[model samples]
Target: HISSQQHEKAIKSYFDEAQTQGVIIIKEGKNLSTYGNALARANKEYVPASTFKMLNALIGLENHKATTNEIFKWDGKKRTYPMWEKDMTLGEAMALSAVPVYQELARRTGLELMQKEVKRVNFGNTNIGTQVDNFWLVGPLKITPVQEVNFADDLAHNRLPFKLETQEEVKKMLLIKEVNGSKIYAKSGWGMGVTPQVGWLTGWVEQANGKKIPFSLNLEMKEGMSGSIRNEITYKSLENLGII
Candidate 1:
């Protein structure tokens, strides 16, 4: 069971401050979330966007399609995101959220294997609906915030169907920052080509005490929105829950 009086207020405060339609789900040990709006939207499905890279990395590793050290070469094609122009390792691609690299990996993995892995994890709607290379992006793939948290829990505990070491390797690639006796492992995603763009930040935090707090947040992004606001809201909510 979960209880939240002040927790709900604090989370709402953060969302209100950001002026965005969002949902957040946090799980500390056996406790569930008590935030009402969050609860309602937790099960609401939306595009996974680049957040799917976490699973893509896992799939790549599991299929032996790519290794951590595999270098994704830039094809000299100019990209809208300048950071993706240079060659990078699989880990670097994960950190950079480089779509092209993962797209190639998916192409290499092929549609059949990709669908199999996605269904095995029971991720999102699992519709993958045509376009194997871009399904998780603009394709039919959709996932709820609560589902992301569940998947993240398995990922954090190395409990996925993949090799334990493969899980660990992917987790290492997902690391965002470590400081103040806490380490945050997460992925950020922004969905384009949609009205009221979607944004996501999902992962877990491990405190010095070894206690793990897993969370997933998604919001409708409006124009003039700052990307950093996603993490800011998440950190504030975690602070309010006294989990940071």
Candidate 2:
């Protein structure tokens, strides 16, 4: 319950001197719970940042524009982070959350295929707008923390519109780390390019019992914030709740 100290503490630890925060965690076979303002802020839609990469992966694979092993050559342009400066595969791009690589894939997929597939999945606003390559990053496309939870769950179960093998192919990159006998898969997103600059941690945690609990949390970015805090909040939420 949001009234519980654990829930509130998990959120407060991150919020005390912060901006709006939204958090939702599902303990398999139990109720869907949220921190204090999660139900409200979590219901609001915001720019998706790199969280769109997961969906982008699905569309790229289905359209045959993205191969798991295909090398994404780096443009000579200077990068946001040095890790993205060299050639890398889909998995490597995912590891770095490389923007240029996925942007190339989006361009290859084209607006026609991109819009068709995005709508087919009924993702977020389903409005890729006119900017095919940067819609999710810059604007005109938005998704709620709630919608993110559902999509994460569906992907966890391989219940998306894509083929099973296709889901598995993309799932490989989401495996960031593990705990005990459990596996945690997630994608971190930072929409620092827009107003209310939000950061995201959306994915599922599978416990030793094999139950997958999908969670999505997006917090308004305060000045001097590091994107890595999203990870701290997520795992702490899971650990405090004994869900991991």
Candidate 3:
């Protein structure tokens, strides 16, 4: 009950401080509670960033088709796309936010398969026009906060349109080994338009004691603000609510 209340208060306070729209939903057993400006914006969308990689990993795992775990020599060669590293694990790729790993995964998965997974997840506004890598930046695919929560719910419940195991793999992929014993699952997408700017940090938090808290929050500000400032806002918000 306290968690639910704090979540509600956080959303209310966030909107009060910034021109933002978001969704925060907490579910325990059969009780499902939600709080936020559910439909604050009528026609706005943001890029999902690495969050889409979770879906891609799920699809690949389900089809017995991911080359992530296998070890390959780097040979000091650059990745197909652009990145600082050479070779990495699927887990490492996610941990370091490696664009090349995801890009390669998407390239192998093909555009059609990616589109199928996107539609299968019922992302509403999210569209996977090309592969995951192509859509990783900001342009082809777009999503709103409400839609983000819906997609997250599907993932949490393992009720994706694909096989149940696929969803399970996705849930597994989202787990981040940080913050003491608690696992942090998050995906961030940064975008800078000519004038307007947008960013995203979406995922769930699973406590070691087995408490699951999910959130999908976006921050939109002027172009001049640094990523650290935005990150500070999110961390401070979580800290104020005793969620850090």
TM-scores for all candidates: the values are: 0.94, 0.93, 0.71
Tell me which of candidates 1 and 2 scores higher on TM-score.
1
Single out the weakest 10-residue window by summed lDDT for candidate 1: 30-39
Model 3 lDDT tens row, 1-244: 4675776677567645655444343334444344445434423577666566676677666656674465423556665445545667776666556666667777777788778766766665557665456674665777765566556666666667767766765666566435766666666656654225566656666677777665566655455555554344455455455555
Query: lDDT: which is higher, 1 or 2?
Result: 1
Model 1 scores a TM of 0.94
- Provide the overall lDDT of each model, using Cα atoms, as 2-decimal numbers: 0.85, 0.83, 0.60
Q: Is candidate 2 or candidate 3 better by lDDT?
A: 2
Residue 228 displacement (Å), model 1:
1.1
Residue 154 error for model 1, in Å?
0.7
The order by descending lDDT is 1, 2, 3
Quickly count the clashes in candidate 3: 0
Model 1 misplaced stretches (Cα beyond 4 Å) = 1-3, 34-39
Q: Model 2: per-residue lDDT, tens digit, 113-180?
A: 89999999999998999999899988889998878888898999999999999999888889987988
- Candidate 2's displacement at residue 172, Å, is 0.9
| Candidate 2: regions farther than 4 A off | 1-5, 17-20, 27-30, 36-39
Residue 194 of model 2: what lDDT? Answer: 89
